[PDB]
Amino acid sequence: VLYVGSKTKEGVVHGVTTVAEKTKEQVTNVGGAVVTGVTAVAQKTVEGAGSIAAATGFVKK
Amino acid sequence: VLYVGSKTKEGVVHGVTTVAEKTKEQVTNVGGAVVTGVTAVAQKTVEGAGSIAAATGFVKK
Amino acid sequence: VLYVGSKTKEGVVHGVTTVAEKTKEQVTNVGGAVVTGVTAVAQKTVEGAGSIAAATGFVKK
Amino acid sequence: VLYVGSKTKEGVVHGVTTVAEKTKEQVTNVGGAVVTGVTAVAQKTVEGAGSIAAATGFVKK
Amino acid sequence: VLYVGSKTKEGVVHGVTTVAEKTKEQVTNVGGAVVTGVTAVAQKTVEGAGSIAAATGFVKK
Amino acid sequence: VLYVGSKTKEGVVHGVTTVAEKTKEQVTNVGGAVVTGVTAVAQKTVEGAGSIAAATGFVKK
């Protein structure tokens, strides 16, 4: 890989905004996965054979 | 891979916005996945054979 | 692959917006996979054999 | 005025919102009035004869 | 004036959202009034012989 | 004026949220008024003959 005089963005995440003033969450999980709210996942390169890169709310049995 | 004088951008997520004033959330998940809200996932390169890159609300058995 | 003085976008997600004032959600998942809300998934390359790139609300058996 | 139990609003401004990501303003005012933004104005009563209540962008020669 | 359990709205504004992704304003002004944005006036009572309630972009001579 | 359990809003302004990432103003005003941003104005009563209640970008000669 060669760059000269370049400005490039790879796997970047930015400017994630949320606005509220009243919010209630009543999660009652027992055995799985519950994801609520804001999250940011940003990779550039991952190598694997059966791997999971960006899991949000994942169960595997 | 060669770049000269380029302003490319690759695998970006930006400017995701949610505006509210009243939110209420009730979940009663027992055995799977319940993802609710805002999630921002961005990659450039993934390698695999049985890989999963961006899993959101994923259940596998 | 070579670039000379080019501005380009590859695999991007921008300017996704939701606006509301009242949101009420009562999901009661019993073992499947429920996704509600906003998610932003963006890659450039996905290499696999039986891979999954962007799964949102995915159940597998 | 004899409220004996009621949920009321009397002259309110709520939930004004503006979404953008690129914005440029160029104003070269010389002798007047220029308004280029977001303004929220709300009253209940005004009095008097020569009265101005909401004067967003007003010139009075 | 009486209210014995009545939910009422008296002169309000809401849900006046606006959305864009590229704005550029180049107003040039010398002698008048210019308004080039979003404004929300919500009043209940105004009175007077020469009253002006909601003037947006007003010139008076 | 009498209240025995009325839940009342009388001249309020809430939730005027605006969102951007890139913003640039180039104001070159002379001898006048220029307003380019966010303002919140909320009154209940103003009393007076020659009265101005909510002036935003006002010039009187």
From Swiss-Prot, chains A, B, C, D, E, F:
Cu cation binds at residue 14. The modification Phosphoserine is found at residue 51. Highly expressed in presynaptic terminals in the central nervous system. Expressed principally in brain. Sequence repeats lie at residues 6-20, 21-31. Changing residue 21 to K: Increases oligomerization. It is found in: Cytoplasm; Membrane; Nucleus; Synapse. Residues 1-31 are annotated as: 4 X 11 AA tandem repeats of [EGS]-K-T-K-[EQ]-[GQ]-V-X(4). Phosphorylated, predominantly on serine residues. Phosphorylation by CK1 appears to occur on residues distinct from the residue phosphorylated by other kinases. Hallmark lesions of neurodegenerative synucleinopathies contain alpha-synuclein that is modified by nitration of tyrosine residues and possibly by dityrosine cross-linking to generated stable oligomers. Neuronal protein that plays several roles in synaptic activity such as regulation of synaptic vesicle trafficking and subsequent neurotransmitter release. Participates as a monomer in synaptic vesicle exocytosis by enhancing vesicle priming, fusion and dilation of exocytotic fusion pores. Mechanistically, acts by increasing local Ca(2+) release from microdomains which is essential for the enhancement of ATP-induced exocytosis. Belongs to the synuclein family. It is linked to Genetic alterations of SNCA resulting in aberrant polymerization into fibrils, are associated with several neurodegenerative diseases (synucleinopathies). SNCA fibrillar aggregates represent the major non A-beta component of Alzheimer disease amyloid plaque, and a major component of Lewy body inclusions. They are also found within Lewy body (LB)-like intraneuronal inclusions, glial inclusions and axonal spheroids in neurodegeneration with brain iron accumulation type 1. Soluble monomer. Homotetramer. A dynamic intracellular population of tetramers and monomers coexists normally and the tetramer plays an essential role in maintaining homeostasis. Interacts with UCHL1. Interacts with phospholipase D and histones. Interacts (via N-terminus) with synphilin-1/SNCAIP; this interaction promotes formation of SNCA inclusions in the cytoplasm. Interacts with CALM1. Interacts with STXBP1; this interaction controls SNCA self-replicating aggregation. Interacts with SNARE components VAMP2 and SNAP25; these interactions allows SNARE complex assembly and integrity. The 'non A-beta component of Alzheimer disease amyloid plaque' domain (NAC domain) is involved in fibrils formation. The middle hydrophobic region forms the core of the filaments. The C-terminus may regulate aggregation and determine the diameter of the filaments. This is Alpha-synuclein. The chain holds residues 37 to 97 of 140 of the full protein.
